[PDB]
Amino acid sequence: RTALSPGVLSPTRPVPNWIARPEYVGKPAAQEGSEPWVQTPEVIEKMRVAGRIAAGALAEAGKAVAPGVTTDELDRIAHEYLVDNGAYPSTLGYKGFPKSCSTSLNEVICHGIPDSTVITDGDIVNIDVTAYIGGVHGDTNATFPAGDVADEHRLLVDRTREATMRAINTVKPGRALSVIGRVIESYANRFGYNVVRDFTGHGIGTTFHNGLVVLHYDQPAVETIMQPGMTFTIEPMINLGALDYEIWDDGWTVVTKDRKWTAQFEHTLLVTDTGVEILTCL
Ligand SMILES: [Co+2]
Ligand SMILES: [Co+2]
Ligand SMILES: [K+]
Numbered sequence: 312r313t314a315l316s317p318g319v320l321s322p323t324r325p326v327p328n329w330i331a332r333p334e335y336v337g338k339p340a341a342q343e344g345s346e347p348w349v350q351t352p353e354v355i356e357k358m359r360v361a362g363r364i365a366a367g368a369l370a371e372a373g374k375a376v377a378p379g380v381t382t383d384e385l386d387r388i389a390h391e392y393l394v395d396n397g398a399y400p401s402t403l404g405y406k407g408f409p410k411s412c413s414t415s416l417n418e419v420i421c422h423g424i425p426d427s428t429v430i431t432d433g434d435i436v437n438i439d440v441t442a443y444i445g446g447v448h449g450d451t452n453a454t455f456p457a458g459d460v461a462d463e464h465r466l467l468v469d470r471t472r473e474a475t476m477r478a479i480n481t482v483k484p485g486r487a488l489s490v491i492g493r494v495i496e497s498y499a500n501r502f503g504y505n506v507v508r509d510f511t512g513h514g515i516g517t518t519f520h521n522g523l524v525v526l527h528y529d530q531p532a533v534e535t536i537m538q539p540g541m542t543f544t545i546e547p548m549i550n551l552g553a554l555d556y557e558i559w560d561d562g563w564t565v566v567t568k569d570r571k572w573t574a575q576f577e578h579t580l581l582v583t584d585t586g587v588e589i590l591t592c593l
Contacts, residue, residue, distance in 0.1 A: 312434065314570050315417060317559060318427035320409060321383050324390045326399060333443050333519070336404035343518035349540040350516045354447055355581060358516065358542060361398070361449030362579050362590030365442035368392040369451050370593065372412065372440070376455040378432040382414035386425030389440050401441030401448050401519055408563060413439040413452075420548050420556055420565040420573045421510055432458035435468060437575050441519065448515050450544050451591035452577035463551070464572055467504070471549045471574040474498045478527075478545045482580055482587035488535035492526040495547050507548035507573070510565075514543045515579055539584045546577035 326332070335341035350358065372389040390411035393400045400411030408424075415423035415437040416430065423437075430436060439452035454468050477498055478491045496506045506528045514523025526533065527547040552571030558564065567573055581588040 312417065312431055315419065315428065315566070317561060317564070318381070320424065320426050323409065324387065324411060326394060326403065330394065330397060330399050332399055333401065333405070335406070339407065341406065341519060343520055344522040346514070346516055346518050346521040348514050348521070348523050349538055350542050354516055355540065355542065357445040357447045358449060358579070358581075358590050361442045361444050361447045362451070363449070363593060364393065364396045364398050364444060365440050365449035365451050366591045366593045367396065368440045368442065369438055369453060372438050373453060373455050376430065376436050376457050378430055378434070378458040380430050382416070382423070382425045382428050382430070382436070385414050385436070385438055386410050386412050389438065393440070393442055396444070398442040398444040401443045401450070405519065415439065415575070417572050418567045418570045420507060420550070420567060421575065422563045422565050424561060424563055430457045433460050433464070434458070435460060435464055435572060435574060439577065446517055448519050449591055450515050450519070450577065450579045452546060452575055454574040454576065466502070467549065467551055467572065468574045470498070470502055470504070471547060472576050474547050474549060475545055475576040475578065478547070479578060479580060479587060479589065482537060482582060484537055484539045484582055484584065486537050487533070488525065488537055489531050489533040491545060493529045496528040499549050505550045505552070505554050507550060508554065510548055512544040512546045516542050537582050539582055541582035542579065542590070544577055544579055546575060548573055548575045
């Protein structure tokens, strides 16, 4: 399998006009980055519903992952699942992004665009899906293997999953946010991988990326302490090779410079009075 290149984009999929759009749809930038980090009880309830629906759309599009299938076909399946549930696909028209999820194969770190690219035997495919319903977002991603994936590349996926699940388990009120990046990068570095630095987790509520940043590497200077009612993502991109990367002419797709493969998982988390709740479950 060699250096991916861009296929061709289908036209914008339509969203029935009854489904409420986030404010940024069709605008160049989003109104976000200065929202409260602690959600009201009502916003948290509504986020369990966004969360379950984006977890539905991810499993559904993930079941279609197979040698043969286009990434456009995954986007179609994700788009249709969100729409049939009354959810707007958060990515659609978000800063001009063209599709309803991001599909990121192999040396694509993140933000790959659904197109006519055909998944081949041995590929790894990340599907990243966000839902917007009742005023709030649910955000979640997983890397799926397609056919006979190399051991090297299976170990990578399962170890990225494992990093994310370790990170999540250490989420509790009163503990420092920098504990997440420490657990992740220590797990990663244990097997010689390299955690991506420029791309982060985020606060999420009534907005997509609300200004709260969640580093996936070890950075103790961050003073932020986790509080009950905090809602944020853990979404680590773990690289087999060098951290260096490039961006396609489409201005979205991020690829590793050395073309070595990379994997990611993501969940949307609630900090509770004593623990953690994962909102992006079925
Ligand atoms: Co995401
Ligand atoms: Co996210
Ligand atoms: K990838």
